[PDB]
Design a protein around this ligand. Sequence first.
Ligand SMILES: *[C@@H]1O[C@H](CO)[C@@H](O[C@@H]2O[C@H](CO)[C@@H](O[C@H]3O[C@H](CO)[C@@H](O)[C@H](O)[C@@H]3O)[C@H](O)[C@H]2NC(C)=O)[C@H](O)[C@H]1NC(C)=O
Ligand SMILES: *[C@@H]1O[C@H](CO)[C@@H](O[C@@H]2O[C@H](CO)[C@@H](O[C@H]3O[C@H](CO)[C@@H](O)[C@H](O)[C@@H]3O)[C@H](O)[C@H]2NC(C)=O)[C@H](O)[C@H]1NC(C)=O
Ligand SMILES: *[C@@H]1O[C@H](CO)[C@@H](O[C@@H]2O[C@H](CO)[C@@H](O[C@H]3O[C@H](CO)[C@@H](O)[C@H](O)[C@@H]3O)[C@H](O)[C@H]2NC(C)=O)[C@H](O)[C@H]1NC(C)=O
Ligand SMILES: *[C@@H]1O[C@H](CO)[C@@H](O[C@@H]2O[C@H](CO)[C@@H](O[C@H]3O[C@H](CO)[C@@H](O)[C@H](O)[C@@H]3O)[C@H](O)[C@H]2NC(C)=O)[C@H](O)[C@H]1NC(C)=O
Ligand SMILES: *[C@@H]1O[C@H](CO)[C@@H](O[C@@H]2O[C@H](CO)[C@@H](O[C@H]3O[C@H](CO)[C@@H](O)[C@H](O)[C@@H]3O)[C@H](O)[C@H]2NC(C)=O)[C@H](O)[C@H]1NC(C)=O
Ligand SMILES: *[C@@H]1O[C@H](CO)[C@@H](O[C@@H]2O[C@H](CO)[C@@H](O)[C@H](O)[C@H]2NC(C)=O)[C@H](O)[C@H]1NC(C)=O
Ligand SMILES: *[C@@H]1O[C@H](CO)[C@@H](O[C@@H]2O[C@H](CO)[C@@H](O)[C@H](O)[C@H]2NC(C)=O)[C@H](O)[C@H]1NC(C)=O
Ligand SMILES: *[C@@H]1O[C@H](CO)[C@@H](O)[C@H](O)[C@H]1NC(C)=O
Ligand SMILES: *[C@@H]1O[C@H](CO)[C@@H](O)[C@H](O)[C@H]1NC(C)=O
Ligand SMILES: *[C@@H]1O[C@H](CO)[C@@H](O)[C@H](O)[C@H]1NC(C)=O
Ligand SMILES: *[C@@H]1O[C@H](CO)[C@@H](O)[C@H](O)[C@H]1NC(C)=O
Ligand SMILES: *[C@@H]1O[C@H](CO)[C@@H](O)[C@H](O)[C@H]1NC(C)=O
Lengths: 48, 252, 49, 49, 384, 48
Amino acid sequence: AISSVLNDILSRLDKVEAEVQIDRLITGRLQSLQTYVTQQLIRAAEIR
Amino acid sequence: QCVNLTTRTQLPPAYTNSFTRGVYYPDKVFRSSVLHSTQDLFLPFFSNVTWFHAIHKRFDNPVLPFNDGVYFASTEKSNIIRGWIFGTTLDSKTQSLLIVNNATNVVIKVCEFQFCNDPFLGVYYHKNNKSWMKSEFRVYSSANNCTFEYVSQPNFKNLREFVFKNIDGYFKIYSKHTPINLVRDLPHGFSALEPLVDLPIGINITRFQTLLALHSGWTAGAAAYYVGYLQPRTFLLKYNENGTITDAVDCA
Amino acid sequence: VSMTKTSVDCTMYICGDSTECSNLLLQYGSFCTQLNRALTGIAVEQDKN
Amino acid sequence: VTLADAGFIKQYGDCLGDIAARDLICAQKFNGLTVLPPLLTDEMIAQYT
Amino acid sequence: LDPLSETKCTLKSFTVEKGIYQTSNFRVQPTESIVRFPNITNLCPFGEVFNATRFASVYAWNRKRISNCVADYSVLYNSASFSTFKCYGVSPTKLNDLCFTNVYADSFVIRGDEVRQIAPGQTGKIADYNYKLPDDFTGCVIAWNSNNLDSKVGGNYNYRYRLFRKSNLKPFERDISTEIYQAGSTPCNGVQGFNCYFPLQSYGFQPTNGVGYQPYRVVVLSFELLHAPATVCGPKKSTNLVKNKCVNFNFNGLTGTGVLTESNKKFLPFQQFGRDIADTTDAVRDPQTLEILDITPCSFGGVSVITPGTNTSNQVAVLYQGVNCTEVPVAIHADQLTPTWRVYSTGSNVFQTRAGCLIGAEHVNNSYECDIPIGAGICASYQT
Amino acid sequence: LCFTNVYADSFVIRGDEVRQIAPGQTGKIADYNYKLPDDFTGCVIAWN
Ligand SMILES: *[C@@H]1O[C@H](CO)[C@@H](O[C@@H]2O[C@H](CO)[C@@H](O[C@H]3O[C@H](CO)[C@@H](O)[C@H](O)[C@@H]3O)[C@H](O)[C@H]2NC(C)=O)[C@H](O)[C@H]1NC(C)=O
Ligand SMILES: *[C@@H]1O[C@H](CO)[C@@H](O[C@@H]2O[C@H](CO)[C@@H](O[C@H]3O[C@H](CO)[C@@H](O)[C@H](O)[C@@H]3O)[C@H](O)[C@H]2NC(C)=O)[C@H](O)[C@H]1NC(C)=O
Ligand SMILES: *[C@@H]1O[C@H](CO)[C@@H](O[C@@H]2O[C@H](CO)[C@@H](O[C@H]3O[C@H](CO)[C@@H](O)[C@H](O)[C@@H]3O)[C@H](O)[C@H]2NC(C)=O)[C@H](O)[C@H]1NC(C)=O
Ligand SMILES: *[C@@H]1O[C@H](CO)[C@@H](O[C@@H]2O[C@H](CO)[C@@H](O[C@H]3O[C@H](CO)[C@@H](O)[C@H](O)[C@@H]3O)[C@H](O)[C@H]2NC(C)=O)[C@H](O)[C@H]1NC(C)=O
Ligand SMILES: *[C@@H]1O[C@H](CO)[C@@H](O[C@@H]2O[C@H](CO)[C@@H](O[C@H]3O[C@H](CO)[C@@H](O)[C@H](O)[C@@H]3O)[C@H](O)[C@H]2NC(C)=O)[C@H](O)[C@H]1NC(C)=O
Ligand SMILES: *[C@@H]1O[C@H](CO)[C@@H](O[C@@H]2O[C@H](CO)[C@@H](O)[C@H](O)[C@H]2NC(C)=O)[C@H](O)[C@H]1NC(C)=O
Ligand SMILES: *[C@@H]1O[C@H](CO)[C@@H](O[C@@H]2O[C@H](CO)[C@@H](O)[C@H](O)[C@H]2NC(C)=O)[C@H](O)[C@H]1NC(C)=O
Ligand SMILES: *[C@@H]1O[C@H](CO)[C@@H](O)[C@H](O)[C@H]1NC(C)=O
Ligand SMILES: *[C@@H]1O[C@H](CO)[C@@H](O)[C@H](O)[C@H]1NC(C)=O
Ligand SMILES: *[C@@H]1O[C@H](CO)[C@@H](O)[C@H](O)[C@H]1NC(C)=O
Ligand SMILES: *[C@@H]1O[C@H](CO)[C@@H](O)[C@H](O)[C@H]1NC(C)=O
Ligand SMILES: *[C@@H]1O[C@H](CO)[C@@H](O)[C@H](O)[C@H]1NC(C)=O
């Protein structure tokens, strides 16, 4: 995407193409959560 | 006016260890209590800076290449380093940049200059009035076309340092200073350099040339100056609780 | 015996205060509720341990 | 053992101004990552011991 | 409707078993808005960038620097005279809603057919030897026909470009060298003999030469954006600043939400913003008055709802996780909140736990076995 | 294919702004007299 920050994208771009920059940040961050949560579930199994 | 200098000395490219200097703020953003990591043109730690020193007997201003960007520093009193030429030719076959200081202003000017072959700014010293008069401007014979101009304002050695970069059409300047009580070694310690000026010059640069003061029939001032190229190298930087870079790691 | 319990608001993490980002995040369906249920499962188990 | 966040409340003044530079715990909280306290306090667990 | 209804929805069920349940986090909505821009007033000199007499040729494109001024762009974007107004990192509809560091208008003329060569990363002799835009170029390009302004019946010959070069030039380099170029190996240093060329060439702009072969005037606007001490900003009116409330702030196109506070951070004169580990701004220097404002996101947290089974009772209690409730009473629903319900904040049955603020449960001194857990040694149960 | 209802909207405009009739566009036609919705489903047909 053109920036790390959602507000920069909504400051610069209109809906038709702001949604393409935002789709990248949603996809990357949802992959960052699923990675953290999988790592934590595997750790939780070790602590158990 | 334009005149060639009497001394024709050459040979030893003197060197010194650039221990911990030539770090500078990578962008205009505040950060504090963080170990931030940045990839940029920087001065590689402990690299050989070329050292130049004027005696009384010795006066050297060689043409120095300018590849990716350069670090410059000087140890002074009585204001002897006064500017830089930059360009790809330096003979009015192509556009070139002039950066200079005098008795009342800094000037910045980019033109089809036909520079002098060994340029300087000249001075008359202690002429009855217990004052020194900046009086010769031996930088160029002609300045045919120009495409930008700017002007504004003019017990220890004065340590000065600068970093110069040309990239994405913009030429950029960073600087800092401190008073020092050391003979020749660049002192062990840290400071980043703040950004001062950005110039939209849009030219090739391949080389540069420092302009000393004269201080024929003259005496050279006891100033020294140090040059090193930058390289693209990742650096990791400790911003303290005040947001000043207090220590640095050269990642390579 | 245990580790720090964490809850992450999947909406604030992905989209923090952007409503248009939130309306795009709904197009990915159930994942934020599934991530809340996964971390709540870990967090309850710290007391059980 | 040096903990990072026990979960025992945050009240703004503990982070704003100075502390948000050196402290990462409130920068996590600002991005929707929240620690939850254990059900048993360190006094309760000690009492069990 | 109420916290029970929020759990019935979250649990996808018309009945709920005994427990404590996560629900939508609460978050204080911003109570008003701020805008701040420099109190500069002089309207930027776009006239001598669009209605200049004679433009410069693309071999020596005339850069004009625009700074320390106010720019309305809607007066350009509304004008039908532009035959193209294509943007490469901002939407033109939002230029009036943005701040620029420095704007360089780079200006020249070309034949219409060549207008395509002006997009970023393009190629062809205009894009290769006389005017290259950088790969990550951020800006707009605006172009229109001037066959009715600067064509001649004999062809205008002031408008020249370049046809040869030892290499394709760097982005935003201009080359005004004039060396005779050799198409064979010939070191023809003297003059433009056979297979040797003056590397400049002329258009001949003539009032019937052809559609698109006719002359177009072009400007490239090239701005640095939203992260430096800016001097070319939009015409939107600045408001007064306010502090300690949650607010929809904008400074210099840094739109965001948060509570502003007087900071003690020692910025240097070149720094406009300070940033978090998360790459999000968390201190700012106001452009009206040189003071550093701390930005903190205004209060929010997980809401957990505590219930006996719905076949035991409809009554519930609410836990606001990590919240010192000296705040939730002040967050009165006279404006909006993320949770639409508020009846529980009617109060007097409000208790502080180290886990957060517990609302709608009666605190009692006698201890019991833990029925529903809360945290930090506290539990809750449904009893007489 | 088959359609719930079809509405044909009809008007005359200049050739230049035939680009303003795309969904989510802006400019005086798209702004002050005929706007297609952000998620419009349909076609635009135009001729001199
Ligand atoms: C910026 O100006 C530079 C100095 O004029 C210019 O450097 C020149 O580059 C060419 C192309 O490589 C060199 O030409 C020689 O190239 C190789 C050896 O490198 C030989 O095989 C060829 O026969 C030919 O002789 C020039 O020698 C070189 N000039 C100097 C003094 O080094 C840059 O190309 C310019 N950069 C831009 C972006 O225009
Ligand atoms: C330091 O070096 C400067 C040149 O690089 C030099 O600038 C020159 O200053 C004079 C005096 O103002 C200018 O002369 C013109 O001044 C005004 C301008 O409006 C006119 O009314 C006059 O008729 C005259 O044309 C020069 O043009 C200017 N040179 C440049 C290149 O701009 C400084 O004066 C030097 N400092 C000292 C102490 O001499
Ligand atoms: C860079 O400097 C050059 C010298 O100052 C300048 O060259 C001059 O360019 C003009 C055109 O702009 C020529 O004007 C002539 O035009 C026709 C040519 O056939 C004649 O009929 C006219 O009488 C007139 O002489 C000059 O002759 C020419 N002079 C020289 C010595 O080359 C460049 O134009 C400048 N370039 C830039 C980009 O600034
Ligand atoms: C971050 O910047 C701070 C502000 O400049 C700086 O604080 C300054 O520290 C010196 C050294 O302690 C103080 O000097 C005084 O120290 C004590 C009294 O506090 C006296 O014994 C001394 O004689 C002298 O008066 C400065 O007064 C103090 N500045 C302020 C405004 O309090 C910090 O040291 C910097 N932090 C780091 C990590 O370098
Ligand atoms: C470049 O030159 C253009 C030609 O002069 C100029 O266009 C003109 O713009 C003005 C407004 O600034 C228009 O004036 C009319 O505007 C409304 C119409 O109701 C009234 O408020 C005014 O009193 C007046 O009637 C002109 O009609 C318009 N002319 C043309 C032929 O387009 C541009 O504004 C100039 N642009 C720049 C940046 O200088
Ligand atoms: C300064 O030194 C240069 C280099 O020796 C001199 O340049 C020469 O000038 C003559 C004409 O006077 C030319 O024929 C030569 O071809 C030039 N040589 C070079 C290498 O360019 C210059 O004349 C000297 N000027 C003074 C004032 O001494
Ligand atoms: C909840 O927040 C209030 C402030 O709004 C806290 O009260 C302050 O507490 C400190 C420490 O005892 C005192 O210095 C202040 O003077 C108090 N101010 C007021 C207005 O009471 C309170 O301690 C907080 N409680 C918890 C559990 O976080
Ligand atoms: C620096 O130059 C000296 C020669 O003066 C040489 O011995 C040394 O190896 C060089 N060191 C580096 C890091 O280039
Ligand atoms: C000394 O200064 C005066 C101006 O105060 C000047 O007229 C005089 O020429 C100067 N002396 C010399 C030797 O030039
Ligand atoms: C804004 O206006 C105030 C006076 O109300 C002035 O002190 C300040 O310098 C102005 N700011 C700028 C950036 O011009
Ligand atoms: C729940 O209570 C209802 C009466 O409200 C009763 O009909 C039902 O049998 C009960 N179910 C259980 C599992 O207790
Ligand atoms: C709990 O007991 C203390 C005295 O030990 C008393 O002050 C307090 O008011 C009691 N709280 C309740 C809820 O009865």
